[PDB]
Write a protein that binds this ligand. Structure first.
Ligand SMILES: NC(=O)c1ccc[n+]([C@@H]2O[C@H](COP(=O)([O-])OP(=O)([O-])OC[C@H]3O[C@@H](n4cnc5c(N)[nH+]cnc54)[C@H](O)[C@@H]3O)[C@@H](O)[C@H]2O)c1
Ligand SMILES: NC(=O)c1ccc[n+]([C@@H]2O[C@H](COP(=O)([O-])OP(=O)([O-])OC[C@H]3O[C@@H](n4cnc5c(N)[nH+]cnc54)[C@H](O)[C@@H]3O)[C@@H](O)[C@H]2O)c1
Ligand SMILES: [Zn+2]
Ligand SMILES: [Zn+2]
Ligand SMILES: [Zn+2]
Ligand SMILES: [Zn+2]
Lengths: 374, 374
């Protein structure tokens, strides 16, 4: 039995940028008040985890990364009321404290307790539950799912259906919910509209799924890797374009294709140039562009504000605009009720021990989501 | 007595940037098919007219500027159905053709027949109705209201109430409707919200009027000219701040004053730096910022897209988002029913012949709106 005890388990530690993960024994402290210790069952490889490796997304190192996952509660600290030992759960990389001005706002979801704006790499109490070779190891986004066991704050975990298939619903922890919500909740895609989706990875395919669910008439996928096109069409793209195939800039191509600009565009890559292209390709008077891709650390884009003065709307969001703890259990219930599909996003299933091979698949352009199984 | 004839009249011709207007005789051709010739009664001096002088807003020279006005139809060309001789009218610097994809869209107002995005300085048929010293003179935004007579396309004029006071309702042709609609229609300011308004000229005061009409609890005016604060408070500002008074950047000041950022911000100046500051000061998760000011020609701003990724919305608009021909007569009717006030915007009245004194008053910081009478 493990409750109240330190657990020694396997985790993938990132000791420094631009190095493979190190799969080795860590010590996981028991949960303190209002904390939850979770036995991991499955975790996805999101491009944002790779951003930690590449230094695109700055967070304190050394670190246990991973934020898209599902598992089973091993133990709860004093005062926890929302989960119990044995519950299936999804860690929430965007917390929902329920008390801050954002949590109380009808349209806010980026809870002020988040660790994304100004990353500390700790629990809410400013300390770590992880050690490795006698050194403290940082948390990542209050989740740290590349470990057989993690500890999260109560505001960073949701209880989900006991009959949930965790090797699929882990994607509701990041990529599916982000993309789908970016379409249905943040953009509010309309029936009969034309959409353009820049980036056809796991998150961009989930944007397509949402645009199709919202009734878009046309969904134009845009990627420099034409190997991504077939799956984009399977989940709802009506046509795909590779910017490398054209002499003109792709904003001009998309404006022409849409007879004067698209209704909704999405940047789902993480490049400054594609954020400006995606804004420019939406109709100048009434178009909406949503930034989903995480930009490179501390870099500014350049744009002409006449793009906005004519009437465009530009916005971004974390986690598809979903209030995380309210939404994740409902999304899982909706998946159980066959309201959407997750299998199209899953190209590879590997044991956790093959994490580096999973990242190599993403980096090579050869995967959408790899699910790692513990 | 002038129908079908060239009219010789006085106009204010701008021959050169950064020079006084020349009040001199022009020839005004009669209206062609679907054109309307208007005897001007009153015209306001909007900062955008000054932008033509300063080269902030590029349009071909020589030009008859003026776009905020009211007058009486002198004659109509063949096929005109929406106005008749003797009707009171407001020229529409944003047309409403009723046929393009923007005019058909429920939100859109920036009709594709506009002359603002890529100014040519002509009528819709690519020609000019004005001659001066035997030389063709450009139009401005299809209106050219700094003339005793102008000719406009039918899609650029609205019939208004016969009992309208033209020396007041000319402001519905630009500055009032722009500011008021930017608050009520484009931002959709909510009851109990906190708003920040950058720039307290005629347009920014109109934004304040709209925020107060929408029920905002706090309306923070921001201007480097503290002489602007008294009138801002009269029309609904709850407090005013001068960035020059503070050691810290004003986005930090406003974030602190609003206990974490404002609900709605407005840039009503025309500076790249204040567009970014106004975005930054709205709450990072659910804030909305609206660009109203006209930026300097062809210049790009620099910004960090993490400001949007957290959840901010950034938009801009022309003419307050109003569909011009539908909306102007209704706004006049509402004014006549005392639903809003225009007198707080009018600080000076001059004859048209004193147009250069009117521009001196604007440039010195003294005026809000000067109304010129023909
Ligand atoms: N906002 C959020 O909450 C959130 C959540 C999840 C992911 N993200 C970010 O979203 C982005 C996509 O994540 P993902 O789907 O896991 O990544 P991914 O699987 O790497 O997909 C990115 C796609 O972009 C394509 N691409 C690369 N460069 C270009 C280019 N110049 N033009 C067009 N296509 C290009 C690329 O070929 C790939 O298919 C990353 O930046 C993530 O960090 C954000
Ligand atoms: N979008 C549209 O349809 C539309 C319509 C009408 C006017 N405009 C633009 O809106 C802007 C305002 O027009 P207006 O009200 O006639 O002009 P205005 O009367 O010149 O007012 C601008 C105000 O900005 C103040 N100001 C200048 N610099 C700063 C600074 N750094 N920080 C804070 N305040 C500052 C200034 O003191 C003045 O009171 C101009 O750029 C116009 O061209 C746009
Ligand atoms: Zn919160
Ligand atoms: Zn992610
Ligand atoms: Zn139109
Ligand atoms: Zn104006």
């Amino acid at each position: 039995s493990t409750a109240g005890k330190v657990i020694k388990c396997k985790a993938a530690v990132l000791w420094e940028e631009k190095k493979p993960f190190s799969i080795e024994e860590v010590e996981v402290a028991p949960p303190k008040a209002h904390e939850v210790r979770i036995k991991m069952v499955a975790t996805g490889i999101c491009r944002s985890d790779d951003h930690v490796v590449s230094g695109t997304l700055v967070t304190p190192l050394p670190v246990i990364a991973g934020h898209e996952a599902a598992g089973i509660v091993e133990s709860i600290g004093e005062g926890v009321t929302t989960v119990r030992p044995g519950d299936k759960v999804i860690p929430l990389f965007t917390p929902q404290c329920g008390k801050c001005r954002v949590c109380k706002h009808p349209e806010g979801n980026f809870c002020l307790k988040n660790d994304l704006s100004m990353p500390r790499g700790t629990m809410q109490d400013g300390t770590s539950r992880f050690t490795c070779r006698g050194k403290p190891i940082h948390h990542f986004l209050g989740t740290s799912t590349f470990s057989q066991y993690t500890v999260v704050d109560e505001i960073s975990v949701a209880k989900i259906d006991a009959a949930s298939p965790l090797e699929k619903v882990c994607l509701i922890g990041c990529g599916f919910s982000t993309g789908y919500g970016s379409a249905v909740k943040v953009a509010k895609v309309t029936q009969g509209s034309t959409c353009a989706v820049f980036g056809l990875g796991g998150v961009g395919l989930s944007v397509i799924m949402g645009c199709k669910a919202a009734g878009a008439a046309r969904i134009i996928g845009v990627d420099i890797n034409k190997d991504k096109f077939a799956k984009a069409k399977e989940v709802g793209a009506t046509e795909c374009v590779n910017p490398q195939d054209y002499k003109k800039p792709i904003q001009e191509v998309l404006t022409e294709m849409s007879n004067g600009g698209v209704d909704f565009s999405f940047e789902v890559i993480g490049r400054l140039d594609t954020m400006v292209t995606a804004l420019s390709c939406c109709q100048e008077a009434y178009g909406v562009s949503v930034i989903v891709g995480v930009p490179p650390d501390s870099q500014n884009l350049s744009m002409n504000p006449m793009l906005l003065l004519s009437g465009r709307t530009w916005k971004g969001a974390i986690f598809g605009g979903f209030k995380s703890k309210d939404s994740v259990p409902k999304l899982v219930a909706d998946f159980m009720a066959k309201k959407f599909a997750l299998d199209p996003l899953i190209t590879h299933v590997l044991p956790f021990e093959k994490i580096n091979e999973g990242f190599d698949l993403l980096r090579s352009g050869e995967s959408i989501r790899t699910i790692l199984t513990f």
